[PDB]
Amino acid sequence: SPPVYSDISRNINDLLNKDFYHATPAAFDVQTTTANGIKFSLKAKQPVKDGPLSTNVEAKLNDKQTGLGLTQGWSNTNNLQTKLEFANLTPGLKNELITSLTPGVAKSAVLNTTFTQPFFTARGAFDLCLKSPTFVGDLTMAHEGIVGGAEFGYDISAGSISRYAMALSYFAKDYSLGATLNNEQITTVDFFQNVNAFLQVGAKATMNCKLPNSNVNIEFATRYLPDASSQVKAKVSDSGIVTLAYKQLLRPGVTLGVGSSFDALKLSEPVHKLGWSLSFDA
Template sequence: MAPPFFSDIDKDINGLLGKDFFHGTNAAVDVNTVAKNGVKFALKAKQAVKDGPLSANVETKVSDKATGLTLTQGWSNANNLNTKIELADLTPGLKSELVTSLVPGVSKAAKLNVSFVQPFFTARGAFDLLKGPSFVGDLTLAHEGIVGGAEIGYDITGGSLSRYAVALGYSAGDYSLGLSTNNAQLTTVSFFQNVSPILQVGAKATSVPKDLTNVNIEFATKYLPDATSQIKTKVADSGIVALAYKQELRAGVTLGVGASFNALNLAEPVHKLGGSLSFSA
């Protein structure tokens, strides 16, 4: 089995702490459908804050299995045209993609991404073709549950290293540990465990840059009451508590609701409520 990409070394704990908490968006709707010929359509809309603007995006994805070519085209209500062209299996494990973004008369961007996956290592390179240009690359190695990786950012025009990061992880089946640091002096230590088939727990500690005496800690749990629902809780040392509930109403229809509040000061006006409704067919 190939090791994860650098950004996925802490995938388990990052998913537990960051995924399926719905308070960050006031309301969201996702609709995903697949035509008989395999063409995929997606409509995503969300309102980040109450009485705020609605952000919406329509996306179409077409794949040709014979050539490994995939075209994804999106168009948002901000008149942003997003295009992704993917080409897989140029050689076993090699994948490339061109990602562009265009807002006519306002902005444009283009990136070339290349990834290579083998049983004992993975490597990626991302070239920003218009900004800089610049390059970000990472390499991950794995052996008997131990995963190590490094990432660098390079300014091609300036000929200088713009950023770097290193990470180390260990997985033993039902639990995993992670350690990472970067040139911003941000260090994180994480722990994740599958306590049982219906319960997950995890925690992450992050040092504050230039203040080694201050560490931010988050703890989260995920509980599956049955095959169609889940309950998540997240607690930060700042006193912010987040709760989330997700329920599959029927096949292809999922409802999510969430809330967050400051447990140390319930009178403080930082409480948030949010919801999400997803359809797939």
Template sequence: MAPPFFSDINKGVNDLLNRDFYHTSVAAVDVSTVAKNGVKFDLKAKQTVKDGPLAANIETKVSDKATGLTLTQGWSNSNNLNTKIELADVTPGLKSELVTSLVPGVSKAAKLNVNFVQPFFTARGAFDLLKGPSFVGDLTLAHEGIVGGAEIGYDITGGSLSRYAVGLGYSAGDYSLGLSINNAQLTTVSFFQKVSPILQVGAKAISTPKQLANVNIEFATLYLPDPTSQVKAKVADSGIVALAYKQQLRPGVTLGVGASFNALNLSEPVHKIGSSLSFSA
């Protein structure tokens, strides 16, 4: 089994802490359908602030399994045209993609991504063709549950190293540990465990070498009452508590509701409530 990409070394705890918390949007709707010929359509819309504007995006994905070519075209109500062309299995384990973004008369961007996956290592390279140009690459190696990796960013025009990071992870069946250092300024330690088939727990601590007294800690847990629902809770040392509930109403229809509040000062106007409704067919 190939090791994860560098950004996925701590995927378990990152998903537990960041996914399926619905308070970040007042309301969100996601509709996904697949035509008989395999063409996939996605429509996403969300309102991040009460009485604020609605952000919507429609996306079409067409794949040709014979050649490994995939074309994804998106268009948002902010007139942003997003295009992604993927070419898989040029050689075994090699995948490349060209991603472009265009807002007519405002901005444009183009990135070339190359991924290479083998049983004992993975490597990625991302070239920003218009900004810089610049390069970001990472490499991970794995052996008997231990995963190590490094990431660098390079400004091609300036000829300088723009960022770097190293990470180390260990997985032993039902639990995993992670450590990462970013630009020698940010240290992250994480823990994730599947306590049982219906219960998961995880925590992450982030600190800087110059301010070891200021450590930001988050803890989250996920509970599955039954096969069609889940309950999540997250607590940060800042006092912010987030709660979320997801329920499959019927096959292809899922409802999510969430809230966050400051447990240290309930009178502060920072409380948020949100919901999400997803359809797939």
């Protein structure tokens, strides 16, 4: 099945968003399942090293039936997030919806409809509650590994098109190259090369075609697995930011993560990021 627009070239942005523990100095995740399968979890993060500790509790369930689902998330700041997944009649056509109920912050309900069919993937977006009807449509076609994609943020209230973005990639067994153009001023390219099951390497460049300011922005990210129960991966950028991350498996079920961010060829400077994470799983 062809990937969805959000999942095109997921392998490259997956190597610089996940398993990075340099942003939150502390992290505390607990996951647990029950007999019938209702998953529950609690996450505790800390953005500022000398500030409060944010915590959210999530209750998500799925079923191998026609596709009913329900997710209820409740954080410290009380933005209750509810999900609803179902297809029922039409197979492959899921109807998802997300809300954010808050006594202080205005609620925002988003309706997503995804139709899955070979060589064709499209997604709808409907905004409710607040008076701002926007349809963030997107289309994706797959032709012998060539994956195309177009995103358009058409505004009903204004009557015009806000965002117009294009993307084109080519998937293969152990290599995939893609590119994207956002509103014809941001150009992004990637070079993902999978070495083997024990090593991954990727590159991501933002050419940013714009005559007033062109500069250069490149990132090289690696991922090395010494063995099954370990992981170490680091990225490097031209600005000197070199971030390292080390994920270790303690007693089977609990994982520990250490992340750090050094700045090369800039002496030491009075700034540095380092943090740890402790994830449990029943």
